[PDB]
Design a protein around this ligand. Structure first.
Ligand code: A1EGE
Ligand code: A1EGE
Lengths: 282, 285
């Protein structure tokens, strides 16, 4: 009963939390859980799945792959049950978080917090992110939706196109800080990995107070929650996503179904109880 | 060429970065890397490897397991190449960090930083953590060595014994906050997993002043580095540990050898490059 979870990286705070949740859920099913990395490379993702098929894994969870179709064909040729997690696929059923709604409540929350510091203008509210993923594009849509309702206007240049990688995000923060002289008063970071780019930027500018900023991040991390600026985070319901990923694998419907799970807004300085219960007891 | 890394949990920041480093090195070796968790339970650790053996895994990295010897006996029956990482085992080769020395330099750094705010007394310097773990005992020893050298005295009553668990650590900070009315000016947190307990404690006491603190944590995380209070972190050279872990897998020498890798002290507000390079550049399909 070997079941595999395919993730882009182990180092990611969201995917690392998913792997912990996945292992426990698989353990309760009596399955044996293994995690493999696709390294966000379609060829690597295909080779990794082929290796898992060669080693006779029973089921695969496909989480955050850049190419869902190529992975599906490999699983289909091997007749290996697979469900998409987090990022949708057309051929197989997908369980994903409600990125648009999560971004909307996140943007509304950081807008309300920043406004307590002083009235805002649309040029004050910026998103660092990208169009490469359905989740990322959905996040910009929720972000624009909350801004449009708040300001009553839309269509400003509020998107700083940054790559999921922190280095491109760091350069964006460096570039923005260069013309404006400050960080935006209210800004949205697309991912926890993007958030690392902000820290790289901040480390380069020791001696800057960065006191006027309010930040909203997709993905949750207790350490990021307690950062010296107020940080609002969206925590996806990974457990429900995996629970639906399971049971969807049991079920034989050929028709692909996309199931959307509502995320939860996390206020600043919140340290939540984690998936590891009594694992770290002596 | 399936090569496995066995970790206690996926969620831990040290083990998650280790899995990232392990994935890259294994890929360069032309191996196929996969990670499994032992949940710090000896029976599940052994049962997990037994299953990997049944599926004919080629090599295994044993990282932070509660029962290194029992895992070794399981590997030995299958003649499966294995090296212990981070936590030593007597029967198989181990690559471990220099926990005692890293703890010593960590304590010296936070002592120096805390002292710059005001003279210290030995009761101001506390450690939250400690475990039957070899790393934990070595860390407590390095902590005591640095305190004794600084103060010129020892036998202070400065170790708050907690499991790795955040909840027990949170209770430890809570009890300390009850007696003192504040957090200690200088304290050492054994693990990044313990560190969550400190955040849980702070979250429980919103609007309450904890006092001015300097914190040293073993293990490194960029977010934890940038916490509003100064956090000094020890970063183990995970890349070297795994490189030494490989090739130790290649060698057929029966004799167990423990290789000690020096960790690096990280000052507050430091963001590293990490083990992920180019992975997050856009694919555009
Ligand atoms: O940090 C995790 C992340 O960047 O991964 C890629 C996206 O699918 C989404 O899960 C996002 O949260
Ligand atoms: O979180 C990692 C850690 O705290 O766990 C206990 C030890 O294995 C040691 O590696 C230490 O780094």
């Amino acid at each position: 009963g070997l079941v595999g979870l395919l993730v882009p990286v182990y180092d990611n705070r969201f995917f690392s939390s998913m792997a912990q949740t996945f292992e426990g859920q698989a353990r309760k099913r009596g399955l044996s859980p293994m995690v493999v990395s696709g390294r966000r490379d379609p060829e690597e993702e295909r080779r990794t799945v082929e290796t898992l098929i060669a080693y006779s894994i029973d089921a695969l969870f496909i989480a955050g792959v850049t190419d869902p179709d190529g992975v599906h064909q490999v699983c289909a040729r091997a007749a290996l049950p697979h469900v998409n997690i987090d990022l949708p696929g057309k051929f197989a059923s997908s369980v994903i978080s409600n990125n648009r709604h999560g971004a909307e409540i996140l943007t509304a929350a950081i807008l309300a917090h920043a406004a307590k510091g002083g009235s805002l203008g649309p040029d004050d509210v910026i998103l660092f992110g990208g169009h490469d993923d359905h989740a990322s594009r959905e996040r910009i849509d929720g972000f624009h939706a909350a801004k449009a309702d708040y300001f009553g206007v839309e269509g400003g240049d509020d998107i700083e196109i940054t790559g999921y990688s922190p280095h491109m995000t760091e350069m964006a923060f460096e570039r923005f800080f260069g013309r404006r002289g400050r960080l935006p008063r209210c800004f949205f970071v697309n991912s926890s990995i993007n958030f690392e780019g902000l820290l790289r930027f901040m480390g380069r500018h020791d001696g800057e107070a960065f006191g006027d900023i309010v930040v909203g991040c997709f993905d949750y991390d207790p350490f990021a929650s307690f950062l010296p600026f107020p940080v609002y985070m969206i925590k996806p319901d990974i457990a429900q996503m995996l629970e639906k990923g399971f049971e969807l694998l049991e079920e034989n419907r050929t028709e692909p179904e996309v199931t959307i799970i509502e995320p939860q807004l996390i206020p600043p300085r919140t340290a939540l109880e984690g998936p590891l219960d009594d694992i770290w007891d002596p």
